[PDB]
């Protein structure tokens, strides 16, 4: 991501199946996906910055809160 600029806009792809490469849980509301270690680290950085990280599918809002889970 670009974390400072002004609007901290960035993108995190999500893989539903727990691949060996991407096996770190993310709970987007009640819908949970899996991402990589760097993606989890930057998501946790955004969470520390206290930034909403809503889940979008095809540009459509699905679920508001993202919280890291078991690695």
């Amino acid at each position: 991501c670009d974390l400072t600029k002004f609007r901290w806009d960035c993108d995190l792809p999500v893989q539903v199946k727990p691949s060996p490469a991407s096996s770190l849980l993310v709970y987007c509301g009640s819908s949970y996906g899996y991402i990589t270690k760097q993606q989890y680290d930057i998501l946790a950085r955004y969470q520390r910055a206290s930034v909403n990280m809503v889940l979008d599918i095809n540009g459509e809002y699905i679920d508001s809160p993202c919280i890291g889970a078991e690695r």
Binding site: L3, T4, K5, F6, W8, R45, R48, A49, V51
Partner: protein
């Protein structure tokens, strides 16, 4: 300290459970330097506000360095718009 006194009076005007003091600054030397500076600033402001006793059970403190700016105009040092201290709380009832 006069400004901090007015802010302490403002905080004393409300009833609350937890205040939060956060510090942001422009990038100067390194991310670690900015983070340490901001945490120290939040610590000091929180300590003064705590001493000027406010009706607050918890006063959380943090400094994210240069993580969440509010303006694209990053030119400047401490005069830059996104170098600031935020005191955020919720009025209790």
């Amino acid at each position: 300290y006069s400004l901090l006194n007015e802010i302490a009076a403002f905080l004393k005007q409300f009833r609350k459970i937890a205040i939060t003091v956060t510090s942001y600054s422009s990038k100067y030397v390194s991310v670690k330097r900015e983070r340490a500076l901001t945490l120290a600033r939040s610590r000091v402001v929180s300590e003064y506000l705590w001493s000027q006793g406010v009706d607050s059970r918890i006063i959380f403190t943090q400094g994210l360095g240069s993580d969440k700016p509010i303006t694209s105009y990053t030119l400047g040092g401490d005069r830059s718009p996104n170098a600031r201290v935020e005191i955020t709380f919720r009025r209790a009832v």
